[PDB]
Amino acid sequence: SKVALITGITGQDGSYLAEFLLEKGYMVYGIIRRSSSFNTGRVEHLYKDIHITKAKFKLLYGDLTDTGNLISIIAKIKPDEIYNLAAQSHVKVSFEMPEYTANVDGIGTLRLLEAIRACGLEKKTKFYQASTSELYGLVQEVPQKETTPFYPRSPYACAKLYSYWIVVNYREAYNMFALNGILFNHESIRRGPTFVTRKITMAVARIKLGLQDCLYLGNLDAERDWGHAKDYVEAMWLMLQQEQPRDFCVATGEKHSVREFVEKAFACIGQTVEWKGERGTVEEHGVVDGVVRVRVDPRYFRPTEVDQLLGDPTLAETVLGWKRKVSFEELVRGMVEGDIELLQS
């Protein structure tokens, strides 16, 4: 049985990827940060009754800023595949801690690549890097594809850009099987609560149950290609099963605005948003049956916004056989219903 190592296994994608690989019969190791409290909620069902289910699943303490810990882990488990999903993954937060973001999301990638070399595993271990459509930033073409030049617009995107290219360089310098999944935005009921989609659906669920009065957002006009994270982790695995390492965009090929996300989320609870005030300004607000339910707060703006992302996944469809399954309609409805069920649980 193959051995997979997942960094960031406690995050949204890592939790779905772990399920995917366990079902394929992998032995799955995950690196978890030490936390002062419980922080494994997304994977707790995978180890809950580990003593009876005998699942090939094991969690280990580590951190992407501690090079020696990474090498110690990799030298002992000698994985067939590493998926580097660990990151300070939030764009807005990256403006507040750009250095930590660079150290985790940039140099952390290199630490793992160097760990492979230091263990002499170049012929054994494949490496997936969690790259991102954020690299396109101020997009230089529409749609964006594997050949679209990058224009990062946050310290997160800059750090992820270092990682994209250090992966390419180790692939080309050392003939390592290392590649970049250029994934566009993907969400789920497991999305972190301060990303815009999950923030919308948690707020709408609370508004339905009368536990919240108003939702405060930033830029309503940002447009994103939005898929379901569960669809996207399989693309990660599929890149590693290719004969030759190559970088792939993964996307739905359609985009929607934050505003439309808001509208669709409220429609799932039978409510209609009417926008009032100068459209696109901080005076704009969303009305439901006369009551202000959405407001704009400049604190959620980013200093350099990424206005619109639209992926062309043609290469992934034809080379990997991958295509999104969850539609945008289904994505929104699944998250709103999930978040209502969570409140009533």
Ligand X SMILES: Nc1nc2c(ncn2[C@@H]2O[C@H](COP(=O)(O)OP(=O)(O)O)[C@@H](O)[C@H]2O)c(=O)[nH]1
Q: Are 3 and 29 in contact (CB under 8 A)?
A: yes
Closest separation in Å from C-beta 172 to ligand X: 28
Question: Of 129 and 197, which has the nearer Cβ to ligand X?
Answer: 197
Tell how far CA 123 is from the center of its chain. Answer: 28
User: Which of Cl ion, ligand X, ligand NAP, none does 199 bind, CB closer than 5 to 8 A by kind?
Assistant: ligand X
Among 78, 145, 199, 295, binds ligand X (CB under 6 A): 199
Closest separation in Å from C-beta 94 to ligand X: 9
User: Which of Cl ion, ligand X, ligand NAP, none does 219 bind, CB closer than 5 to 8 A by kind?
Assistant: ligand X
- Phi, psi at 211, each rounded to 5°: -110, 5
> Is 122 annotated in the active site?
no
224 lies in the site for ligand X, by CB under 6 A: yes
Question: Of 229 and 273, which has the nearer Cβ to ligand NAP?
Answer: 229
**Residue 91 vs residues 156, 195, 225, 234: alpha-carbon distances, Å:** 6, 9, 16, 24
59 lies in the site for Cl ion, by CB under 5 A: yes
Closest CA to 116 of 232, 5, 251, 229: 5
**Interaction with ligand X in 18-57: which residues (CB under 6 A)?**
none
Question: Of 47 and 275, which has the nearer Cβ to Cl ion?
Answer: 47
Q: How many residues bind ligand X (CB under 6 A)?
A: 19
Q: Crossing angle, helix 328-344 and helix 196-208, to 10 degrees?
A: 50
Burial 268-295 (b: 16+ CB within 10 A, else e): beeeebeeeeeeeeeebbbebeeeebbe
Stretch that binds ligand X, among 65-73, 123-131, 167-175, 194-202 (CB under 6 A): 194-202
Stretch that binds ligand NAP, among 87-95, 265-273, 303-311, 325-333 (CB under 6 A): 87-95
Chain breaks in the chain (C to N over 2.5 A) after: none
Q: Are 129 and 167 in contact (CB under 8 A)?
A: yes
Residue with tokens 């390492």: 245
**Interaction with ligand NAP in 100-129: which residues (CB under 6 A)?**
104
- Phi, psi at 178, each rounded to 5°: -135, 130
Among 102, 306, 331, 340, binds ligand X (CB under 6 A): 306
Stretch that binds Cl ion, among 41-49, 137-145, 152-160, 335-343 (CB under 5 A): 41-49
Rounded CA separation 225/105 (Å)? 22
Q: Where does this chain bind ligand X (CB under 6 A)?
A: 91-92, 134, 185, 194-197, 199, 217-219, 222, 224, 258, 300, 302, 305-306
**Which residues does the annotation mark as catalytic?**
132, 134, 156
